[PDB]
Symmetry: C3
Subunit: 489 residues, 3 copies
């Protein structure tokens, strides 16, 4: 007596945004933005990071007496460093090309300390010099990785040292120069005035001269110490020559592991976890293509956008409004086996149903849409943090401009794409329902009476079999032609 | 006995383009590209700019005698400079890290001058030197903000001078070193050979030595002056030591207000006018998201693209070729809606408008336009940087980045406008067909279709009838028997 | 009598992808990505490049004896260099601002060597020194474009030299400083210790001092040579002065032409062809806006993406199967005249047809869409690739990040745009067929019997003229209204 065509409604309350309307309630929705972390600094690929504590990279490499817990350091995934470390250079001074050194350390996962110039080889000089700035238990001391050379008796002969890199990998060597505060200091320490420090390799040639002047007091001293570094290649020799003011190295750091890493600025401590993407606030465990947790990330991470919600409409519109009418008035609550379906009402009882073909096709289409949006984003290993000195403000501003531009582009594209796709899927569902209605109408032809709310009354008597035939798409119009014709007039 | 469904046409001649057609006439349109400007140089947020005129930043800071009008500069919003300033370094020479100083000046306002080393403290030297390159009224002169130390009598005692920064903010200090032309000049001015100039702070350590050589004549002189600068922190000291060739400062430059600003290269003058976005050709006053006036801007300005027109379709097509309905074309009689009815019966014809559909479509189009416009992020930013003559690669990098972003935004904006125009022009047609189908479903067999846009009834149906058809409360059973009777015959 | 509305099918096997479906067979497709090249290095705009071979730029400019074939070189479009050239600085040393020199010299396209300081004017010094580091036929030699000054007898007087730039354009000048190995070498070659080299222009001002120390042996020598360069403006003067350790120039390079060029790092040889875009693997000639051959290109080249397929659907969906049914049951194979058409079966004879107005409109729309996608992308001359020193790794990382970000942006945008436009095209074709069906039905009205498979069965006897009339759009309802009513009731 009746067969109606409609769609499915539920008790959901998820709202989605569209380029034409705002706050539209849908049956189902998928979130493609991640907003949750665990709030803990954790391991990366199972390898604990290098927790420097209150030390700095220079303090670790030079061997500050307050950083004695890092004399031997195992393999690491990344480096954790405070924004303002307290234990850096105990003796005041500088460190040439510090940022380049940090960037180099952002690509090595393990070192190996090798003794290259033993302290006992300097038989003609004093090697037991220290200062009150780097004091240990009230006694003056010095760095644990470098040697301070001083006159023995009243003579300072020319000091020579060499090292042939037979270790098996690239080696990093750090030396220093000393700038005293007065000519009295220079005479007391080296016995001669007008000295030089010469360092030379196969591709490096550097000569330095000490500067003697009165400077403001830092850590109680008016003197400074300038440190420089180099990368010694395999089977390559490095030569040291100096008449005074040479802070010679005793160890060299050879690169052993090599990989991808970075420096992260936090103020926390490592805990027991395991993650793939790490942020200064916490770790991220997701498969979504976007997130808004933090811009500075280390690892394989989703894209960062400046949005608050990015929801893709998967299901139909929720119009809870409902003999029983069809899809013109609204959705159906009693149909739970699919998306688009039927309701039949004859002399053998009423009931709902579902159309498997149309629902399956729509489901496949929506799944493919979501997959196309999600799996077309390329994810790699990147470290966003970068360090620039106070004389490189233009470079820092260029970096900041690039990051801001990329962020703006991705935010705009993501938001507009979500809005347009939501509009298209909301039109897709209505098109599907109307196509089903039109197919049923063209199959039924004049044998029925289109009421106008969404369904038809038959002009004949139809049992269950004819209802299934209409639902299955195998109506036999000529069989009921004569019977249905009589009742029309 | 007729009721037609159709849309609205006028005499507008605006033109829009879509992804499938070009040069399409529409009833209404919105331009989202700004192409006009005031033509003057304005004040940004009320504050007048700093007009240097014929002077450079170096000339203003060092105190060129021809820039004596800028000795007390008030608060400024941005800096106006010429491409090739005439009045810079009157005495030939160079300025170390000039572009970094300009970049620092990009983010400072008002500024304040304090005297740190009075010219009268140098009791053991001569302080009244001058040159003909910087001459006033024919007589030789020198920079206003600097002091040239020369021997007094026949001796040049060691020169010392210190300043403790108790002003209350960071400070900018500039000093210099003199490179003479021959040894006789050196002995005439300083009485000694082999001199040095040493400058030291808590984080700076610099020693410089004069170089004496024959050089080409610039402004009549074969000698040069080299200028350097530093940023002094609060409660920090700066020390000066020299045995010759020292150009000591007298005034120390102190930062008063900070913020966002920039440097604009222009050949104009300031006029009485105000804005929030500034361009070297004029001032922009618009709310649109895109503009094409000039790539270099200072302030809160729209995105710059290389396009001539970006027009959004907010209305229907103009097809006024005609009573007939929406199949043939639009109507001119409708003046209070987009979709409506024209009715014709025994008691007088006329037009009308469907309020619900028009309101829904108007809200949708307004939401679309607002979504396109309001999703753009506008923040203060100043395009334009300076690079020296040994930094071609950095300038090329900056140019490539800006060009890439420009290309991305241009392509995105054009394609988005095309696609949205196509979507809107399909949306209107779908709305009109929806109204037609709704009316047909309500009217059912009681009427006859015409393939033109309207229906001819099978009964007599007055204004209450026709309001009900427009209202949506047509009652089928009232005329079912009457309207059937005429249909068979 | 019948008239069915349908579309066109063929035997194509090309497939496109959409946002809702994958591997959809289409009648006509357009590939907008270029994947092929000629595999050879050719001339840009009809001008051969500069083939350095085994000598590097520094060795070419200094005049290394092993690349004497480059003493005079003609016009060039770009430069072909090897990744690790063999003949560079024969005498071990360094070269200041080398990358800046390469970047500047990548925009020159022609030089002109000019003798600025002849070797016969040094009448108080010995100018025949040479080394075994770069020797010819077993005898010591030196760089061809530079002069090594050594003491004459037992004296080294102060050396002075100047040049005024009257050539006509900017001129490039290179000089050097020699760093000995011990004091004995210094006293043997220059007779005094504590020397300097001073170079001065209207803008430049430089003073240098040699460094004497023991260094590891490279090419058997413990000494090094340091080279510097400058640009001399028109009507400017350059001054030289030295008490020792000066490698003076003899020639100067002036800039004849100026333009767009770059440096290619390849190990191939020039062959006879001509193109507008060049890659290290080959050359590209195309009108498509995308390619995936090689990231580093020189010329006006399409955008580079990380994709393997970018196909725009131009035609219809290809459902092969089709009394003769209409567009409900599938496409039509025998209608090779257009996209949307008809089919009739009357007494006089059956046959196919093709609607002209709808097909023309659809063709114009699709062509406009393709032209909008292609022609809106701006192509400019660009040379991708920069050289950075081993102490500027941060700048190299910055450049790499910029290039990678732009590559990802363009890749994502291109793939999503293709996926979207394919869906709109496939929906557009179905909309067109539906619109034609509805137009015929509403024009032609109750005089027929809709069959539901895509066409109608006329109730009257429609001859040919009526068939062209309904196909025309000028059907006459009142003519057959009375006759149709008679048979319909029965
Ligand atoms: C080794 C020592 O005690 N040196 C001090 C020096 O001693 C003189 C000795 O050389 C001479 O033969 O005999 C006289 C007595 O007749 C002295 O014993 O005397 C100086 C004062 O005249 C000291 O001055 C003060 O030293 C302070 C700090 O000492 C340390 C430091 O903690 O920095 C430690 C060592 O003295 C020294 N390290 C060495 C030699 O390896 C360093 C050294 O001076 C650095 O170069 C400091 O820049 O200094 C303060 O530096 C204070 O300002 C200064 O007046 C000598 O310490
Ligand atoms: C103070 C003065 O006039 N000096 C000139 C010098 O005169 C001498 C006297 O001071 C000395 O005791 O005895 C000798 C004789 O034994 C002189 O009587 O004579 C020089 C030539 O022999 C001058 O040369 C010319 O100076 C020019 C520049 O003068 C200025 C200038 O206009 O730039 C200004 C000052 O006169 C001069 N000195 C100071 C302290 O400012 C400076 C200075 O010389 C340089 O400009 C900077 O180092 O320059 C031209 O430079 C010209 O080329 C040169 O021949 C002495 O000016
Ligand atoms: C001219 C010459 O033969 N010099 C070699 C020198 O002979 C001395 C001569 O200068 C002196 O007047 O008289 C004594 C005899 O009383 C000698 O005859 O002897 C040196 C060894 O003690 C040399 O040693 C080796 O030279 C190698 C290469 O030599 C050359 C070269 O081809 O690079 C030869 C050039 O004539 C010489 N001069 C010039 C102006 O180019 C250069 C020059 O020394 C370079 O600056 C080297 O840095 O060197 C190797 O250099 C090897 O290491 C060295 O031991 C003198 O070559
Ligand atoms: C949509 O709903 C949110 C609450 O989730 C509300 O803040 C916002 O104002 C709503 N927007 C409109 C246009 O009503
Ligand atoms: C350094 O050691 C390698 C291998 O033992 C050797 O070939 C090389 O000659 C050595 N270097 C020097 C300067 O002898
Ligand atoms: C559209 O009109 C403009 C001028 O209004 C004209 O320049 C252009 O050629 C026209 N486009 C076409 C396709 O005719
Ligand atoms: C500079 O002045 C501040 C003011 O309190 C003082 O603390 C500081 O010690 C002074 N500097 C020196 C070097 O005395
Ligand atoms: C039309 O609809 C409105 C709905 O508010 C109703 O108030 C009015 O009585 C209706 N009029 C007719 C003639 O149906
Ligand atoms: C599409 O076809 C290709 C071969 O042409 C095949 O590799 C791929 O798996 C197919 N994809 C789907 C979804 O069937
Ligand atoms: C260099 O030549 C130009 C033109 O011949 C001349 O004007 C200039 O004075 C010359 N330079 C010098 C230092 O004389
Ligand atoms: C078809 O329409 C065109 C329109 O001008 C007309 O010229 C032609 O005669 C028509 N054909 C028939 C068979 O009516």
């Amino acid at each position: 007596d009746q067969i109606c065509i409609g769609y499915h409604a539920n008790n959901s309350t998820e709202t989605v945004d569209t380029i034409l309307e705002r706050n539209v309630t849908v049956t189902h929705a998928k979130d493609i933005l991640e907003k949750t972390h665990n709030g803990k600094l954790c391991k990366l690929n199972g390898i604990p990071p290098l927790e420097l504590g209150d030390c700095s990279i220079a303090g670790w490499l030079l061997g500050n007496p307050e950083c004695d817990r890092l004399l031997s350091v195992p393999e690491w995934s990344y480096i954790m460093e405070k924004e303002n470390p307290r234990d850096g250079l105990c003796y005041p001074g500088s460190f040439n090309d510090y940022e380049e050194l940090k960037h180099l350390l952002s690509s090595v996962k393990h070192f190996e300390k090798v003794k290259i110039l033993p302290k006992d080889r300097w038989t003609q000089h004093t090697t037991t010099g220290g200062s009150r700035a780097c004091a240990v238990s009230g006694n003056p001391s010095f760095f644990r990785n470098m040697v301070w050379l001083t006159k023995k008796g009243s003579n300072y002969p020319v000091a020579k040292g060499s090292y042939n890199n037979t270790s098996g990998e690239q080696m990093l060597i750090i030396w220093g120069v000393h700038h005293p505060n007065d000519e009295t200091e220079q005479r007391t320490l080296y016995q001669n005035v007008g000295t030089y420090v010469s360092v030379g390799t196969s591709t490096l040639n550097k000569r330095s001269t000490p500067d003697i002047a009165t400077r403001p007091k830092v850590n109680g001293l008016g003197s400074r110490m300038e440190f420089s570094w180099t990368l010694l290649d395999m089977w390559d020799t490095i030569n040291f020559e100096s008449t005074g003011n040479l802070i010679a190295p005793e160890y060299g750091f050879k690169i052993s592991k090599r990989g991808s890493s970075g420096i992260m600025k936090t103020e926390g401590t490592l805990e027991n976890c395991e993650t793939k993407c790490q942020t200064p606030l916490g770790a991220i465990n997701t498969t979504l293509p976007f997130h808004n947790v933090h811009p500075l990330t280390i690892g394989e991470c989703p894209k960062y956008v400046k949005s608050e919600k990015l929801v893709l409409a998967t299901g139909l519109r929720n119009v809870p409004q409902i003999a029983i009418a069809g899809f013109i008035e609204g959705g159906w609550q009693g149909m739970v086996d699919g998306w688009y379906g039927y309701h039949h009402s004859n002399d053998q009882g009423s009931g709902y149903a579902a159309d498997k073909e149309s629902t399956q096709k729509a489901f496949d289409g929506i799944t493919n849409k979501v997959n196309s949006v999600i799996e077309k984003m390329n994810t790699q290993f990147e470290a966003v943090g970068k360090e620039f000195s106070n004389l490189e403000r233009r470079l820092e501003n260029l970096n900041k401009k690039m990051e801001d531009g990329f962020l703006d582009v991705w935010t705009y594209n993501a938001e507009l794409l979500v809005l347009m796709e939501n509009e298209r899927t909301l039109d897709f569902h209505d098109s599907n329902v109307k196509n089903l209605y039109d197919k049923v109408r063209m199959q039924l032809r004049d044998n029925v009476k289109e009421l106008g709310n969404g369904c038809f009354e038959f002009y004949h008597k139809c049992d269950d079999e004819c209802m299934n035939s209409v639902k299955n798409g195998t109506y036999d119009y000529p069989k009921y032609e004569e019977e249905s014709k009589l009742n029309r007039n």
